[PDB]
Amino acid sequence: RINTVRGPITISEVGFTLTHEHICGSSAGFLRAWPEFFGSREALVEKAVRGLRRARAAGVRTIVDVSTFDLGRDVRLLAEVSRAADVHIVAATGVWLDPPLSIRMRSVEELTQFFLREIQYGIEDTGIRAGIIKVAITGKVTPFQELVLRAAARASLATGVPVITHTAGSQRGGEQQAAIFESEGLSPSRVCIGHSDETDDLSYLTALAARGYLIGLDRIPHSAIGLEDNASATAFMGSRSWQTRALLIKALIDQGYMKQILVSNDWLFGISSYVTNFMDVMDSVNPDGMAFIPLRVIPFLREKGIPQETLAGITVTNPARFLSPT
């Protein structure tokens, strides 16, 4: 069974899953301290519920919200939105790229215990347990990021819960992360190397897939094309089209890797961790939001000749195998 913000669900109940999404990109405590940054908590809930309900109408049954403590994960927000939209949400533990001092001063043993608290006991006082561990690196893994990766591996070996990563920007960091994970004895089948659609290097992707890693092509809608005059947009969403991103799904299917592929939008309903009103720029590129994958990518891949069955395998079977604890 998989833990969600509404409690445990069976695999059969998971259904069509977007495995890399967020309700709100933020910082720890920030939504509680300054909800009016989002116009109000109530407005952000309403936006999230309308968006998830549109995704649900397009067939989405589950999302995995990969926001960690330091991305401002608010598990009560997740719970409210999950229940109102009636879509399963899996919450996350782990450490993203903006740890505060109380996180970044911690040893590997301490970080392991924090992730275990979140998976085993619950998040804060809520009893809501994490279903995935999210980690991130920049460039070359920093000493602190290596501690986070080792703690993630150890928490996953203890609980069976999977790890999702990424490397900041379009740097291809999977091989360095995979080295660390394997040094801890973590099976590749527990690890998704995320934001892998940021690169065209198919040799890099195929080799990771061939080792049994899951490949997150999780950014598909993010494109700054047409937004060339917005330098903040280009830095966040890149210059590659969504079709270019989507064709990596095809390329990996064609190389025999369909079982290793996880697809998502990396969308959200509010963001405070970047420039002000960035959500508006995002919303203007992808008015579909989280429904982008079912509504637009899926038919795109069918049209390129991929079998509905192979698409169902990527969007249903792969996420269930990935999320079910081992």
Next chain:
Amino acid sequence: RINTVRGPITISEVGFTLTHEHICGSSAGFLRAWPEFFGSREALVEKAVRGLRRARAAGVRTIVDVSTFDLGRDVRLLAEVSRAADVHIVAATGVWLDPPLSIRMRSVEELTQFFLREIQYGIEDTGIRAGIIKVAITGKVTPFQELVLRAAARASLATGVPVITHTAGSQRGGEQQAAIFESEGLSPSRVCIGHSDETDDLSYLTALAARGYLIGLDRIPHSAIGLEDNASATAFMGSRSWQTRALLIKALIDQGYMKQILVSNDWLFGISSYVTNFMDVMDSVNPDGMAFIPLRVIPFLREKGIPQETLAGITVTNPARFLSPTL
């Protein structure tokens, strides 16, 4: 009136005040996400209540908790401990040295609104309103720190609440905070230059006091050494003696500046933003906690011949003048 975590109090209720303290040094959301770091929330509350009751029995009536959002301020913790200890606590807005992205991406105008929300409306959902604005800088003030200082000046000018600031990693640089604050039209009498006991340069402190700034000699018990192993202990407390620090209080008095002096401990009852078990290092060097000022420093100054009336001016009158909102 002055806002506290229990509501508004009158000037005459403020009493002997420690103007630079913390209940817990932490990070935003951390005490809620990992209270077992502190052994438990229940354990942190008990320790804080005992420590504030000790300070109270030593004559303390009010503390100012200068912890900002990014220092992990939990106003519900402050309200709980203030009630159980019967010591008023004034809470803070502002930005310390660990702003997360959602803060460090903000403009001066946005930060001004955030500080105004916490002063005028309340902190989080609690209705508890900040009574001071805390800001911090390093080195040569960074561009982001300059934004924070100007937003603080604008929030103070709109509400009358004062500003407490310091320069981390050096023993001067109040001159940087002063130039920026004055460029915004802020009166120096609304500003305390904190951690001023870290320097031995008295001409520097006297020149700020002559301009009307208040001088925080607020780190007095952090002098302590004897721990020559720890890079941690020294890189944070340092190598001087507390007496030498306390003598800066007498030095400013002798220069005619008694009205400009605020004294405190910069203590806390939990700390997660540095090395694990740093709290135990701090408690071993200063087992008096927040009672160190009234139990050690005040009698030391008395024995150096400072009169009662002067010591009451520093500990009672100056903090009430500082904290009372004055536009």
